[PDB]
Amino acid sequence: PIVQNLQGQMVHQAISPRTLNAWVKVVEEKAFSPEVIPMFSALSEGATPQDLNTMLNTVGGHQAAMQMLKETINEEAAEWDRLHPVHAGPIAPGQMREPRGSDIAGTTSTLQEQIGWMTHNPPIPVGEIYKRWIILGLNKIVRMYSP
């Protein structure tokens, strides 16, 4: 995640193993139950896309759901690209590039790039955009997996 250091700057720090394991354990115990979404939300505080793929990729089991989510993440990403067209002409030397759906999904962007966008002024909340897609896709799952 990207956290604020004592000095008063935003720097990246790694997520903790008993945080990781707590994510694992939630999924083990409460599967598709709604409490998973606030839980997720708390444990995703200050998290990167990269950390969010890590959390999704580290799941075991419920592979039908994991595939449905993936496909929701790509749909929501396809929709990001649709709604926000690429911008006019070449990229400025003085500036950094606008993200695509796949940069938001973490796929085409690097960590330093993910830190550029979030730490820069104005900052862009690429975590929160992926977060809604995850929560939206979580609703899809919850609604389906209701019996």
Binding site: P34, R143, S146
Partner: protein, 74 residues
């Protein structure tokens, strides 16, 4: 399981039924106004005859602690 399929047993305490209702209501994602409509309507409708009778005597305007204490002996 669908919200329409939530019903109170003939020997089941209302209390255990109301818990089931707001759990299933907890998995419904509808507008609040619709969920208010579901609350006043479906809950009583699928309640058992003995408690149903009781709840009809509370009239309208009733709140959950009063419903929950009203159908306790049933």
């Amino acid at each position: 399981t669908s919200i329409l399929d939530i019903r109170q047993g003939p020997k089941e305490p209302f209390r255990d039924y109301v818990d089931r209702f707001y759990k299933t209501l907890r998995a419904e994602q509808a507008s609040q106004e619709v969920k208010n409509w579901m609350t006043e309507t479906l809950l009583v409708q699928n309640a058992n005859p003995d408690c149903k009778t009781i709840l009809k005597a509370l009239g309208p305007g009733a709140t959950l602690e009063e419903m929950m204490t009203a159908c306790q002996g049933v």
